[PDB]
Ligand binder design. Structure first.
Ligand SMILES: CC1=C(/C=C/C(C)=C/C=C/C(C)=C/C=C/C=C(C)/C=C/C=C(C)/C=C/C2=C(C)C(=O)CCC2(C)C)C(C)(C)CCC1=O
Length: 315
């Protein structure tokens, strides 16, 4: 048993790889097309769902850069936005790179508001997307909403300076919320599954109880978010929880458990997940794939975004 082999459990699980597919196509576009594209994608999104107001604690980390941009001319603002899209080496792009996804999202949500308000340079009124950009946008509109918001988030996260090239830095993230009181936790129920570790995983995460959640993992275990590489080691996993996994609502529905190598157990769970950005307005179709050692500790868990609601019944 290795992490590489663990990634392969439950191979008939059909992930929504249309997301990385579309991201690849989007990445072929010019910075100018990218900004215009996302503006139109953002407006399209607004036809059905509204972004929740970012937390004040989150925005205080973006406030400095936002203030600087707001005081710029339209031409200067557009250049900064192009710099972010191009991953150009600039002070703003380097600052951006140290931010967690939620801070990056709150930052762009504010710029979007200011674009609507006339405070930040808008997309040119009669701007024409390239043929390829148009086609990418058409494909976006054809995907379910869970896949749509995942594409937009991924693109936001990938802007700015290459974080890897910053070497060591203080990571900027939202402050920790106190875990929910036990009496206030709404425990999950999973049809076909009684596994204590899986239930503890779901309930602790829903409670923002990361200190108890991390105890479920083995030292050298790993967690794999949708479409990215596994995050290895309890230290990295806990940091991921604290920085990116606050105020989620996991609503698992069904699951199955099977024997695995070396006395391990593998467990597949399907259900829905809500992000605090949209709440109940977007229930993403998810699968969890656990690999548990004989002591019931988590060696590996993959979290998949599924290709369609039909996959929820694929056990
Ligand atoms: C950029 C841009 C703009 C702005 C655009 C804007 C403002 C875009 C913003 C878009 C927003 C707010 C997107 C939010 C996405 C959140 C998702 C997909 C969360 C998923 C979480 C999941 C599945 C959780 C999963 C989890 C579970 C279940 C676990 O079990 C373990 C934890 C884990 C995390 C893995 C403008 C409009 C100004 C145009 C110019 C321009 O470029």
């Amino acid at each position: 048993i290795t992490i590489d082999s663990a990634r392969r459990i439950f191979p008939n699980t059909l992930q929504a790889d249309a997301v990385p597919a579309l991201t690849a196509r989007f990445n072929q576009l010019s910075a100018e097309d990218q900004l215009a594209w996302t503006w139109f994608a953002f407006l399209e999104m607004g036809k059905t769902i509204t972004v929740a107001a970012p937390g004040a604690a989150s925005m205080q980390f973006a406030e400095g850069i936002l203030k600087q941009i707001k005081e710029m001319t339209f031409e200067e603002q557009t250049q900064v936005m192009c710099d972010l899209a191009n991953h150009t080496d600039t002070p703003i792009c380097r600052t951006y790179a140290t931010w967690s996804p939620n801070i990056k999202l709150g930052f762009w949500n504010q710029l979007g508001e200011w674009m609507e308000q006339g405070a930040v340079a808008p997309i040119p009124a009669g701007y024409q997307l390239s043929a390829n950009a148009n086609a990418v946008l058409e494909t976006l509109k054809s995907l379910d909403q869970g896949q749509q918001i995942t594409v937009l988030r991924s693109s936001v996260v990938d802007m700015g300076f290459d974080a890897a090239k910053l070497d060591g830095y203080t990571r900027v993230a939202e402050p920790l919320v106190a875990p929910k009181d036990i009496s206030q936790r709404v425990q999950v129920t999973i049809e076909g599954i009684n596994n204590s570790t899986v239930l503890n995983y779901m309930n602790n995460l829903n409670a923002n109880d990361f200190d108890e959640l991390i105890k479920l993992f083995v030292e050298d275990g790993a967690l794999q978010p949708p479409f990215q590489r596994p995050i290895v080691g309890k230290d990295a996993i806990l940091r991921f929880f604290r920085e990116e996994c606050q105020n989620l609502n996991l609503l698992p529905e069904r699951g199955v458990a099977e024997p695995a190598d070396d006395g391990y157990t593998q467990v597949k769970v399907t259900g829905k997940v809500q992000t605090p950005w949209f709440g109940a307005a977007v229930g993403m179709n998810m699968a969890w794939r656990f690999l548990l050692n004989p002591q019931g500790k988590i060696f590996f868990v993959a979290i998949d975004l599924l290709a369609s609601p039909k996959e929820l019944l694929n056990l």
